Amino acid sequence: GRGANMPFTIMEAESTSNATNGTKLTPNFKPGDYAGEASGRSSVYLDATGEYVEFTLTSPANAFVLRNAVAENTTGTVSIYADGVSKGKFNVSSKFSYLYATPSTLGRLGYDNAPGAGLTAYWLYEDAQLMLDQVYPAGTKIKIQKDAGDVSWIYVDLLETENVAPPQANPDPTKYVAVSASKSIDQALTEFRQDNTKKGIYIPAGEWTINSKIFLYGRATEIVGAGPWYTKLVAPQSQSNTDVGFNISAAANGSTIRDLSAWGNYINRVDGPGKFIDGNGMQNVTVQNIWVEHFVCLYWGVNSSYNTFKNNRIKNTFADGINMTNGSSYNVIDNNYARGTGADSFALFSATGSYNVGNKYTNLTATNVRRAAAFAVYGGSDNLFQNLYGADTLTYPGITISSYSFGYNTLGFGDQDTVIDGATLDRTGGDFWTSVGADDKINEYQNFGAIWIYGGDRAIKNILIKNVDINNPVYFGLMFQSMSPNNMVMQNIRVENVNINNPSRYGIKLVVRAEQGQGPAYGGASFTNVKVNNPGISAIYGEAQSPNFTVTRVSGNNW
Ligand SMILES: OC[C@H]1O[C@H](O[C@@H]2[C@@H](O)[C@@H](O[C@@H]3[C@@H](O)[C@@H](O[C@@H]4[C@@H](O)[C@@H](O)O[C@H](CO)[C@H]4O)O[C@H](CO)[C@H]3O)O[C@H](CO)[C@H]2O)[C@H](O)[C@@H](O)[C@@H]1O
Ligand SMILES: OC[C@H]1O[C@H](O[C@@H]2[C@@H](O)[C@@H](O[C@@H]3[C@@H](O)[C@@H](O)O[C@H](CO)[C@H]3O)O[C@H](CO)[C@H]2O)[C@H](O)[C@@H](O)[C@@H]1O
Numbered sequence: 399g400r401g402a403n404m405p406f407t408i409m410e411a412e413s414t415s416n417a418t419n420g421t422k423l424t425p426n427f428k429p430g431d432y433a434g435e436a437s438g439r440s441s442v443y444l445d446a447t448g449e450y451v452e453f454t455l456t457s458p459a460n461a462f463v464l465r466n467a468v469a470e471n472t473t474g475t476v477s478i479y480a481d482g483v484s485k486g487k488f489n490v491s492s493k494f495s496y497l498y499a500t501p502s503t504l505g506r507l508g509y510d511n512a513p514g515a516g517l518t519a520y521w522l523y524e525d526a527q528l529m530l531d532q533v534y535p536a537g538t539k540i541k542i543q544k545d546a547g548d549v550s551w552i553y554v555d556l557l558e559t560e561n562v563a564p565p566q567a568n569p570d571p572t573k574y575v576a577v578s579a580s581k582s583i584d585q586a587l588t589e590f591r592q593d594n595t596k597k598g599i600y601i602p603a604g605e606w607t608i609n610s611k612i613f614l615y616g617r618a619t620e621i622v623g624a625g626p627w628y629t630k631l632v633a634p635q636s637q638s639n640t641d642v643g644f645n646i647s648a649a650a651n652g653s654t655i656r657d658l659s660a661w662g663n664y665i666n667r668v669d670g671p672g673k674f675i676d677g678n679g680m681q682n683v684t685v686q687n688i689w690v691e692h693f694v695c696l697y698w699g700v701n702s703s704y705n706t707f708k709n710n711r712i713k714n715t716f717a718d719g720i721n722m723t724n725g726s727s728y729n730v731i732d733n734n735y736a737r738g739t740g741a742d743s744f745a746l747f748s749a750t751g752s753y754n755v756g757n758k759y760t761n762l763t764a765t766n767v768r769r770a771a772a773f774a775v776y777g778g779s780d781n782l783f784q785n786l787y788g789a790d791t792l793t794y795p796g797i798t799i800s801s802y803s804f805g806y807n808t809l810g811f812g813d814q815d816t817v818i819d820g821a822t823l824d825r826t827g828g829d830f831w832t833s834v835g836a837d838d839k840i841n842e843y844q845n846f847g848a849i850w851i852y853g854g855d856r857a858i859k860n861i862l863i864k865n866v867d868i869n870n871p872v873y874f875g876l877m878f879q880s881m882s883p884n885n886m887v888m889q890n891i892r893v894e895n896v897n898i899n900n901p902s903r904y905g906i907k908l909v910v911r912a913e914q915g916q917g918p919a920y921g922g923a924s925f926t927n928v929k930v931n932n933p934g935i936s937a938i939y940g941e942a943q944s945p946n947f948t949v950t951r952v953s954g955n956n957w
């Protein structure tokens with residue numbers, strides 16, 4: 399296991415270890431398709447009473463997350479069985495899935511929630527969470543089965559299984575003011591602020607409304623739940639796109655929020671509001687073991703430094719999972735799991751405080767990225783991305799490495815290495831933008847490899863990509879491209895110990911002409927022990943057509 403170490407186990411419904419009398423979808427890479435949008439690009443379709451998928455626990459479990467697709471505008475159930483005995487019902491719904499666009503307007507992915515004439519549905523999968531009153535042992539047969547009264551049809555994509563500890567009590571009621579049936583989050587924080595013996599607030603097991611942005615000020619604040627399966631912060635679900643969560647004022651730098659879940663009411667992307675945590679320039683804040691869904695982002699840092707995001711679960715958001723921008727340095731984004739983000743799952747955007755520096759994105763998992771990349775780094779200096787797992791990108795690379803400025807004021811990459819070290823990227827890449835007049839055309843889109851190295855309008859230099867396994871990328875393993883006419887010379891771009899397995903087109907693509915008016919790459923890159931295995935067409939494309947780009951084959955290359 400590369401990536402996050404999480405207490406839950408993921409099993410694909412379509413796994414060959416699972417008996418089923420339903421319909422296993424043949425894989426594809428199509429957005430807007432129940433196979434293309436599934437984890438592992440396949441799911442099991444249950445379509446008649448009595449159809450099931452039978453999972454086998456490989457670890458003890460009392461709790462489950464079922465990723466699934468149901469019809470638009472429906473809510474209902476699907477049944478769970480343990481060793482042949484019915485044990486309850488998942489609450490399944492398309493309330494948060496189904497976002498509408500057209501193949502030529504994928505720029506709108508995530509923004510537009512209503513069906514319409516000529517619109518195609520995307521973002522088809524969503525999740526149902528269920529805890530059972532018993533810990534079932536490894537080897538237990540857990541059956542997801544469509545019974546009478548359950549939904550008319552359901553695509554079963556994957557199952558999380560987890561052995562959840564009992565909820566933790568208030569660590570000390572004389573130091574943590576408890577949220578109660580009669581005392582709100584806001585009221586407990588007021589009592590906390592006015593009593594200097596309090597370290598913070600404790601939010602018990604339950605469902606607690608967050609209908610506002612809850613401001614943390616006065617001093618560093620501890621916000622402690624009972625555990626993410628127990629303490630549920632819930633945005634009013636009869637409202638939609640309510641900007642709720644926490645806002646950490648500078649006075650509350652050094653705060654900690656942990657051991658709770660937060661359930662937003664966003665049903666489409668909104669730019670501006672919608673981050674669960676607002677923390678304008680916050681420092682030394684710790685966000686740990688929380689589980690957030692249906693917000694625009696978990697957090698969007700702006701000159702936020704020395705913070706720690708650890709052990710979190712970020713699922714089904716409408717834009718980025720975590721992004722750190724405009725000077726955000728020396729942060730610890732460690733051991734977080736992301737599935738179903740609406741833009742770059744984990745991103746670092748360096749702008750203006752010359753650069754984002756000294757950040758460490760470690761032990762990160764980012765799957766089912768419904769737009770943009772699993773991991774993305776835009777400029778910066780001395781930033782480490784280490785032990786990553788990315789898989790199943792709908793429209794973009796597993797890893798984007800870009801010195802494009804997006805019109806903002808940035809210097810690009812700095813004089814110290816941006817390092818990608820230890821990464822597994824399964825079925826990443828996709829289609830986006832347009833390729834009018836493009837060389838190497840296969841469709842109406844630009845086509846993206848597992849890792850995109852993009853020289854934009856700013857310096858593209860000091861990039862180290864090592865110890866990377868790239869499995870069945872949609873199109874390419876590595877994709878190098880320079881934006882014209884800037885033609886920034888790539889320097890100190892090095893690739894070491896990389897395996898690219900069964901790319902449909904090429905192991906490595908030097909983009910010659912992305913679209914009309916665009917040219918080949920400038921500079922070069924070195925390759926050491928880079929193996930390309932079974933490319934659909936050839937190992938490398940574009941070398942003879944890129945006369946300003948020098949491929950250096952140091953050693954160990956089978957191409
Ligand atoms: O899913 C990607 C991205 O989309 C949204 O953010 C948009 C943001 O990217 C930008 O749009 C583009 C730039 O990305 C850039 O794209 C050019 C493109 O025009 C194309 O010809 O080819 C190259 C690649 O070979 C692209 O880099 O530049 C153009 C024009 O300069 C921009 O329009 O700005 C738009 C709004 O103007 C954003 O919508 C999305 O929000 C974001 O989350 C996502 O990562
Ligand atoms: O309107 C809110 C702020 O706008 C400016 O800040 C931008 C950030 O909020 C952020 O916005 C992202 C947006 O560009 C797009 O990519 O969608 C993301 C997801 O919803 C947004 O978070 O990032 C931008 C790029 O760094 C910022 O320009 C103003 O500078 C700020 O004062 C406003 O409060």
Ligand SMILES: [Ca+2]
Nearest residue numbers: 410437440555
């Ligand atoms: Ca699956």
